[PDB]
A paper describes a structure:
In most bacteria, chromosome dimer resolution is performed by two site-specific recombinases, XerC and XerD, whereas in archaea only one such protein, XerA, is thought to play this role. The Xer enzymes belong to the tyrosine recombinase family (hereafter referred to as Tyr-recombinase) which is one of the two large classes of site-specific recombinases. Here we present the first crystal structure of a full-length archaeal Tyr-recombinase, the XerA recombinase from Pyrococcus abyssi. XerA displays the canonical two-domain structure of Tyr-recombinases and assembles as an apo-dimer.
Therefore the structure of full-length XerA was solved by molecular replacement in two stages, using the separate domains independently as search models. The final model has a resolution of 3.0 Å and displays good stereochemistry. Surprisingly, analysis of crystal packing of XerA revealed that two monomers, related by a crystallographic symmetry axis, form a putative dimer. The interactions in XerA are mainly stabilized by contacts between the two αK helices. The XerA structure revealed that the extreme C-terminal αN helix packs in cis into a groove located at the surface of the C-terminal domain. Within the XerA apo-dimer, positioning of the αN helix in cis prevents contacts between the αM helix and the catalytic site resulting in the exclusion of the catalytic Tyr from the active site. Interestingly, Y261 is located at the end of the most flexible loop of XerA, at the N-terminus of the αM helix, and is extruded away from the active site with its side chain pointing towards the solvent. The conserved catalytic residues R135 and H226 of XerA are within hydrogen-bonding distance of the sulfate ion. The simplest interpretation of these results is that XerA follows a cis cleavage mechanism despite the unusual orientation of the catalytic Tyr extruded from the XerA dimer.
Author numbering:
A (entry chain A), B (entry chain A): 9 to 252, 258 to 279
């Protein structure tokens, strides 16, 4: 019942936690279960915002959050554990890009590899790391989708793509003399390892310049968002395709079909 | 050369970083490369402790650390990236346990599963999470070792074990009607999932009480350390076996043989 919390505290002592932090965590954890909250990511938040309205600092909230998170790891509930991430400060973004601009950026590609990167980042709206990490095995030709591996503690995801894109991928894969798992690779002294985010970033500004726009990888993911919506795709599916509980997969390949996104330039 | 850093900053803006934090990171990163330091975990530290001796706060150092770490992820150098962890505050531990005490704790086991847990935590000195996560595939009967999977960003490791221990494992595995990957499992409504750290902790106090000692999982890993050394095994190998650049594997199985650790009680 409570002897657990005594144990949780020494747990933290041994993980190198400061005896005052331990004091604090233990404090809030006890309080949490005193209310009657249950060991989930929902009751965490329904406990946290009560504090917020009661007037608690940001550093104070951040601490409570991380206290709960550490506890969940201890209970072993690692599902509920990563759900608790302190939502990032939302920035406003540059104006969304147009079809004309996207066309000019795509068409600026020196190589097919570069082209496929751009086309994926936008036609599939990938994050830079999803891209940097996407293993070629995840390009599923039978269903005509990319599977975007769920990251450190996220969820797997399935982005349908066109035959046109699936074609260029084949063409490009045929052309690959290496044993690297990854869809994209950069040449080094150590021939053929994985892309960094720096590299995607360098590469995106390159073509951004040639097509005459100050550009970033995100700008492509975001125009994906915008245009999917301009086309008349309900915001929820788009919010599905993008990641960030009615889901489907033959509807995704269907609605992404009607969008004709990538096709409307290649 | 430097246009990278401009890009690194917007990188952080988009990851939701505060424009002042970005100011700071960028500040220190520039400074780092101004010295002439090279993008590694070593020159990070040879840069950090210079600051420390120049008088920089803890929160100030922690910030610089995390600035570099974020940058490395961006360069894609994820090798050097996790090497930089701010070393945990070292606690002093309870007095090391004796052979007699270890025997009494082992022998207190209700079930074979419980016994094997205790015997591993001590005879193999595992961390609680290494234990909670060890997949049964990693029990290598041909070489007579456990392979301890390197964690989130650590390194794989190989702990030799006795035939006696390898025996009980077989016996116990024969007795397993489930399809869970893991060497140890706990019964729930959701029959046969993985152990939490709470569970190992509950279980260790149980047998700790029966044998009459206030005990923790770490106390077992630590007595492993002590006794390996009492026996005359050079501290470096022990420091190898434990994890936390001359390495070997037929020397580990050899020296761990001479220790007769587990044998000296079962
Ligand atoms: Cl279809
Ligand atoms: Cl041997």
């Amino acid at each position: 019942r409570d002897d657990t919390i005594e144990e949780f505290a020494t747990y933290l002592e041994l993980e190198g936690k400061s005896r005052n932090t331990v004091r604090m965590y233990t404090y809030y954890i006890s309080k949490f279960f005193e209310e009657g909250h249950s060991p989930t990511a929902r009751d965490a938040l329904r406990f946290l915002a009560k504090l917020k309205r009661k007037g608690y600092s940001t550093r104070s909230l951040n601490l409570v959050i991380q206290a709960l998170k550490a506890y969940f790891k201890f209970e072993g509930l690692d599902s509920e554990a990563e759900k608790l991430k302190t939502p990032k400060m939302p920035k406003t973004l540059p104006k969304s890009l147009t079809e004309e601009e996207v066309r000019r950026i795509i068409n600026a590609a020196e190589t097919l590899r570069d082209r496929l990167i751009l086309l994926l980042l936008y036609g599939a709206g990938l994050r830079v790391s999803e891209l940097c990490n996407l293993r070629v095995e995840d390009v599923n030709f039978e269903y005509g989708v990319i599977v975007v591996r769920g990251g450190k503690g996220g969820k797997d995801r399935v982005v349908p793509i066109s035959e046109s894109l699936l074609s260029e991928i084949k063409r490009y894969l045929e052309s690959r003399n290496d044993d690297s798992p990854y869809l994209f690779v950069e040449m080094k002294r150590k021939r053929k390892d994985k892309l960094s985010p720096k590299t995607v970033w360098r590469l995106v500004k390159k073509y951004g310049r040639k097509a005459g726009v100050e550009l970033t990888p995100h700008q492509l993911r975001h125009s994906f968002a915008t245009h999917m919506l301009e086309r008349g795709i309900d915001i929820r599916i788009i919010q599905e395709l993008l990641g960030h509980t009615q889901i489907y997969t033959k509807v995704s390949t269907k609605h992404l079909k009607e969008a004709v996104k990538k096709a409307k330039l290649v």
